[PDB]
Symmetry: D2
Subunit: 410 residues, 4 copies
């Protein structure tokens, strides 16, 4: 027996040679993209033979073997329906329907704080999916860049814990939700911020990352991190939104001084510089596609699913998912934890970073916010999603009424 040849006959159809396009559409049907970094060696040798013998273009059994040799094990699971979502083609059409149901909920008002988010038009709406296995799909405005804003708070919290450990980080910031009556308080009762997802907590967390180095190298350190989470897809930076966040963070300056007075930063902290670093981190840009890979990195125990390098310790992604659960959506986190039951983080540019643990990561983006600060279309999508699939943290995997389970076949 030989794994490359058994997969040959699977696609061969009892026939004698396989056209390459028939192989290519067979592959994309799995949800894989031909640009997948785990597939480069296979694709590089297909493009080569598609030069060496323009003659063709059909593959013997032993040239198919020459190309899939390198990435055979990943290819077999794709064609033997072993990915976490086996029928990826039907799942994506569900996403498409869920997308179009959100697309009609046209309320909310775009963030007006700076001329840079006000710049964004309300009809932009994109969702993109990345599974824990690398299967992708997008629909809508998924290649438009936008800033993470408070979508970055879980990403840097993971880095802090990854680099420093739970006990250190949570010596400086709590691990509970405020309570719907304390969106106004900076500190909890032990004089630490309530959790990493609130502005005072995010700021203290920023104060821990890569201490003793200057603000340029801290920034590069975090972005090399954010690149690994996204498999080197688009991670950018808008100086435009940074400058205006610099002139309008009166409240953040209020928090900054309060924290200095109550000695909540590590010793030797330059608080006014830390705020600048914090302002920068909120102006990091992503698209819906690149961020969906980040979310899937958290969904995948810290391994970036399209590259397979370990980016975060399991201790960091577990901690981050727990605090996204309960403190991820501003005042909506209680209701969101109840009705949707997914770790998510929302941001004021209209982004909602969504994680379905052990399944997939997502990014939804629509600039118009509701009155609690969350993307209107995004929130509508996430209710529609859990109402359709048994992804709620406390759905049952065995008995789930008329919910669909995409992890199953028939």
């Amino acid at each position: 027996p030989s794994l490359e040849d058994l997969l040959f006959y699977t696609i061969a159809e009892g026939q004698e040679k396989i056209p390459v396009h028939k192989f290519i559409t067979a592959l994309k049907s799995t949800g894989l993209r031909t640009s997948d970094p785990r597939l480069k060696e296979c694709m590089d040798m297909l493009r080569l033979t598609l030069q060496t013998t323009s003659d063709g273009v059909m593959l013997d059994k032993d040239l198919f073997k020459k190309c899939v040799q390198s990435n055979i094990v990943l290819l077999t699971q794709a064609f033997r329906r072993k990915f976490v979502i086996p029928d990826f083609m039907s799942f994506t059409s569900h996403i498409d329907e869920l997308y179009e149901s959100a697309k009609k909920q046209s309320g909310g008002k775009v963030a007006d704080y700076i001329p840079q988010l006000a710049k964004f038009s309300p009809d932009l709406w994109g969702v993109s999916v990345c599974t824990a296995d690398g299967q992708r799909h997008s629909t809508g405005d998924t290649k438009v860049p936008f800033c993470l804003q408070s979508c970055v708070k879980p990403l840097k919290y993971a880095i802090a814990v990854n680099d420093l450990g739970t006990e250190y980080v949570h010596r400086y910031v709590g691990k509970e939700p405020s309570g719907l009556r304390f969106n106004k308080l900076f500190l909890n009762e032990d004089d630490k911020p309530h959790n990493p997802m609130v502005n005072a907590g995010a700021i203290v967390v920023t104060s821990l990352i890569k201490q003793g180095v200057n603000n340029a190298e801290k920034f590069d350190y975090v972005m090399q991190f954010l690149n690994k989470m996204a498999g080197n897809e688009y991670v950018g930076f808008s100086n435009a939104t940074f400058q205006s966040e610099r002139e309008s963070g009166d409240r953040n300056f209020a928090i900054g001084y309060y924290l200095k007075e109550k000695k909540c930063f590590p010793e030797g902290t330059d608080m006014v510089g830390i705020l600048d670093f914090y302002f920068q981190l909120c102006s990091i840009e992503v698209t819906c596609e690149s961020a969906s890979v980040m979310a899937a990195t958290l969904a995948n125990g810290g391994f970036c699913p399209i590259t397979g390098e370990r980016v975060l310790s399991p201790e960091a992604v577990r901690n981050t998912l727990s605090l996204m659960h309960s403190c991820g959506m501003y005042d909506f986190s209680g209701q969101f934890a109840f009705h949707v039951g997914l770790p998510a983080k929302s941001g004021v540019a209209g982004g909602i970073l969504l994680v379905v643990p052990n399944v997939m990561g997502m990014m939804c983006w629509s600039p118009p916010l509701d009155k609690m600060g969350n993307s209107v279309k995004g929130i509508h999508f996430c209710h529609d999603l859990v109402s359709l699939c048994n992804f709620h943290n406390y759905d049952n995997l065995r008995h789930f009424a008329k919910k669909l389970d995409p992890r199953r076949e028939g």
Copy 2:
């Protein structure tokens, strides 16, 4: 082919016949108990053949099939190691280690506010396990009855939602945690109690179950329900602790009158009777074994794992696990959700009802409480549990460090 006969040879070893003791010892190894309700027809026909002629306790291929015919699909799933924890005999050996390691944490104070918990000894400590498949194990004082107290709060919430639906119930009670600055408040901004796990909420939820019937029959109804959840294992009642809660619930009466004044009960409520009903509900008795089965009913989407009966609507069970997550351990719910990440509910008798969704249900019980109200041994156990296995709600099932996963071989 013949699957009753296929299983005969699995246990028979290609040898003559199966001694019956060798069959049941194989059976207990799976984690099933011979008293399993789904096995009665098999056991009934074992009791029949053991009267045929008392020695030569051996089963041919056709008398073995004579007994296992009725329950063959469940028996093969056990013997083809298809249960949620395949190597169950090894998992229980870890339970034993976790239990006996927790046994050494002898700090805490027994609740003394009533003489009925004050008579309970601090050295009692029991742990019982029930999988989503009916595999059982216990260690310690697992057959001693004790009151649920506020471990009953999620159970009646489930009943309420099961019978009346999310939207009605949550017209009368919120669905978020108070906030560690609010175990002192009864009502949130909308003048409803914060969630079903706090006393004002539980009291309101109690006012929803089986309205229009009197308190005797409401109680009979809830007992019938808890019987379904526990597979007809021990559910009782101690009139003693009921009396003392009745003479000692000044705080409960304070809450009741606040709720009556701010009109949080359904119309036609006899508020002072509902308090009486509530006191009864907290004096319902369970053992660790019986209650662990109730926990497993929640772990299993509302189906009782030792009977197969559908006991709760999926909407009821999801909701309850959701609110056990964030509001289940008094002031410890935040720290508990973060470190343990399992839906749990604690009570002042020393109980902790624990759910590991899609795996198993649990009940731990040792009366000495910590200064937040949670059983000291219990809390130590659930930390040790999640630290050993990847049962944390936000562990990864694929990449989980040096944690052990009992669902795998």
Copy 3:
């Protein structure tokens, strides 16, 4: 020289005999009423001589001497303008204009939570004055009975301190205002009610009065007290209001059980009987005239100005005035102390018991309440009052701009 005799000539005006009616109106102009208990001896012998020498209504120098001999010292202070308000006749016309200006403020809603307060018409409006010297004036519906409701809280607090002293009472009850959103909280940090003027505080105080006796004599003990404070004018009791307040005091019972749980009562307290007693004290009736004298005993260091009876210790009256200043008018107490700056207590029947220390007491009554619980016309009257006179707690008695000073002459 001669005590009665020059006082004869002061009123005689060089004449031989004084018409008796001319004596009576001269006396009434001082503000004294001829029914004053400190004047009974003089009046008894005035009508007696109007029988014994029934023909000829005039008094020589020695028959005037026959009648005023008993009350001469009080009589001279009245006629030598030595009373706290010398020109009482001009002060009253101001009261009347102030009354007529409030009579136009026709907004508000009458308390309807029980049918007995709903019984009262919105157009009733009464004001009565009693100085620290016994001068009286009324205008409007000043002889209509109504319940004190929370106007009784300062009065029973005084009895408690009078009988037990500051230090004991304030073991069980605070002495500060809540803070304008701690009105739903029953207890402060030390697990005592915030002050005696909140319902929880009043209830605890009720628990200290005459401990160890049954409710009938406790009630008679308190009422025996109030009669003295009012110089034995109308103090009554509405059984109707008592029944309906007990029927419907769910929140009060809520408070009662809460206080028992947090052990706020003295040992051996029967909590539900104390509640019954509290409801009774809230259904005690006064008219504007009878209560205005009670207010004056507080204005007068504890001496009832129309009888000379010492009714309350100076420690009791100081404490009670202190807490009416800051906590007496529900959520309006801060605004009321700022703008009016007088010790006052409001009640849900529409009464406002007002004290001008060292000057006078008043009670205003109009059933319509505003949305904080205070009589609309009542509150309007007290603003008008202090804008007119230097009665504000911190006006200056020497430099006071264009305010009028009734304690002074011309």
Copy 4:
């Protein structure tokens, strides 16, 4: 008749000539000081004639009148025991006892957050009195300069209301005390600081004074203003304390940014300049004598009692006295109002500015503070003060137990 020598024989003894020393000693007996500004012309005229004659240090009836002619009306009330305290010489002997009893209370901690208050000795302790009539007395370290710190809070609030009126000023700051459970919050429910006596309130009040001019002229405006209030006694400035207050007022900047974000300042405010000005205002220096005169301007309806100048509108003095009543002693304000019943304001240098309305003003100073921020010796002194005399705001002027009344003679 001639009221110049009606007074001559009063001091003369039926005698001959009056020695000059006997006259001024008779004068200091009144409590007036020979340095009284209202006595300049008289003192200048004593200084002139005590040049002419080294022989005959004595005053005929015609040269006494030559000197006292101009200030005769003030001198007559002094010798005619018409001052607010007729027997001032005994009242100061009580002040001495009250001082010596406080001298024994050696607890507390000198404020150490800045080295400028930290080098102050713990045994410095001074008390100074100034009546509404200009009578003066001091005991202890009454000429040692120290900073007002938060004792300046009422003074600038007075200026603010004096220049713009109550209604404008209170658009930017409330008028009630927070409540002993909200000393941590910056803003009330209407998004204004709770009152002028808390740091958020003072900062906003600072933003209203003499708007539109630069900080140099703003400071000069307030400095003369305080000059008028103190009758031109010592008012200074410690640049040392100002410097240490700006490098360590982390909480103050936090407050400023919060107020800036929630738009609590009038439009056109340079928030960080207002903080600079505020720090300056807290580093104004006084002595006990000079500050007690400021207290006396507040006791006197806005007239400085040693110069006769009108410095504050009565509306300004009422308002400030009202808010010193309830918010003047930090978390001790409720207990202080209940037990002492006088408007006072404390500051962290150990000062307590105390007002007994219509009687006298005071400044007490001992740097050791208690655990709430008030001078230990200071607080002990004012308790002892009011238990001795009927100065409590709700004492009775007629029935006041065995308390002493310094306003009466026998």
